[PDB]
Paper text:
CFH and CFHR proteins are encoded by adjacent genes and form a protein family. CFHR proteins are composed of four to nine complement control protein domains, also called short consensus repeats, and the two most C-terminal domains have relatively high sequence homologies to the C-terminal domains of CFH. There are only two residues that are different in the last two C-terminal domains of CFH and [name] (domains 19–20 and 4–5, respectively).
Patients with the autoimmune form of aHUS nearly always lack certain CFH-related proteins, primarily [name] (CFH-related protein-1). CFH-AAs often cross-react with [name] (13, 15, 26), but the exact location of the autoantibody site on [name] has not been determined. We found structural differences in the autoantibody-binding site of CFH domain 20 and the corresponding homologous site of [name] domain 5. Also, the hydrogen bonds stabilizing the loop in CFH and [name] are clearly different. Our results suggest that the reason for the functional difference between the most C-terminal domains of CFH and [name] is their varied ability to bind to heparin or glycosaminoglycans on self-cells because the loop that has a different conformation in CFH and [name] contains several of the heparin-binding residues. In this model, called the “induced neoepitope model,” the normal structure of the Arg-1182–Leu-1189 loop of CFH can be turned into an autoantigenic conformation upon induction by at least one microbial ligand binding to that region of CFH domain 20. Our model provides an explanation as to why immunization against the CFH-AA site could occur only in [name]-deficient individuals because, in normal individuals, the presence of [name] with an epitope similar to the hypothetical induced autoantigenic conformation of CFH would have guaranteed tolerance to that conformation of CFH.
Author numbering:
A (entry chain B): 205 to 329
B (entry chain A): 205 to 327
Write the structure that this text describes.
């Protein structure tokens, strides 16, 4: 019996159809994440008993921070082949600046961006 | 001296120019919010002493809840029944469903969207 109101917005993501004021039971609408956002969960929500099915989250990309690399004495190995912004699941390959050795308890030299977070490595003289 | 790295991404907002690997001192780039979002803070950030200044947040729109409305014995005043999504700062004017009166003593019939949250009236 229960119809659904309009579909809820989500961060960095849109519906692929124009919103209606009222949706019938079993109606579905479909979401789509912004370009560098990784669509996650169900791409379709469906109207089940007055309720909207839960909408996906859009996983954030990463920026590579010059601020940090400068601090942690690191540089990019393939500077030309290196994207400044990373989709989730895309990696970064660093290297120690000349005159520096890799830290001990540090993270590895290659690091995948996961939803906004990037684990950087550390270097010492 | 004190170049900046790529500018920081913000939710539901992009920069207006193509992003660069390195920005000179005094550089500035500009944020704009996705269509139904409202930019709060400085639209423009600037590179000083190797650091980007604070980026704006993009305040959220509100979706009018049917589930809520029916439950509060309210509905949209007719000429506004098509305004499903409110930009922050945009208002929804409510009326009481036939029969009920303004509850004792809820928030006003007129109510404003602030960053995705709407304070509904009750009847």
């Amino acid at each position: 019996t229960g119809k659904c109101g309009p579909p809820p917005p989500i961060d960095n993501g849109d519906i692929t159809s124009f919103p209606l004021s009222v949706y019938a039971p079993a109606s579905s609408v479909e979401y789509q994440c912004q370009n560098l956002y990784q669509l996650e969960g169900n791409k379709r929500i469906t109207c089940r008993n007055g309720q909207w099915s839960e909408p996906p989250k859009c996983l954030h990309p990463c920026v590579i921070s010059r601020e940090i690399m400068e601090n942690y004495n690191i540089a990019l190995r393939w500077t030309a082949k290196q994207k400044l912004y990373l989709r989730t699941g895309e990696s970064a390959e660093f290297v120690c600046k000349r005159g520096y050795r890799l830290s001990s308890r540090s993270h590895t030299l290659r690091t995948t961006c996961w939803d906004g977070k990037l684990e950087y490595p550390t270097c010492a003289k």
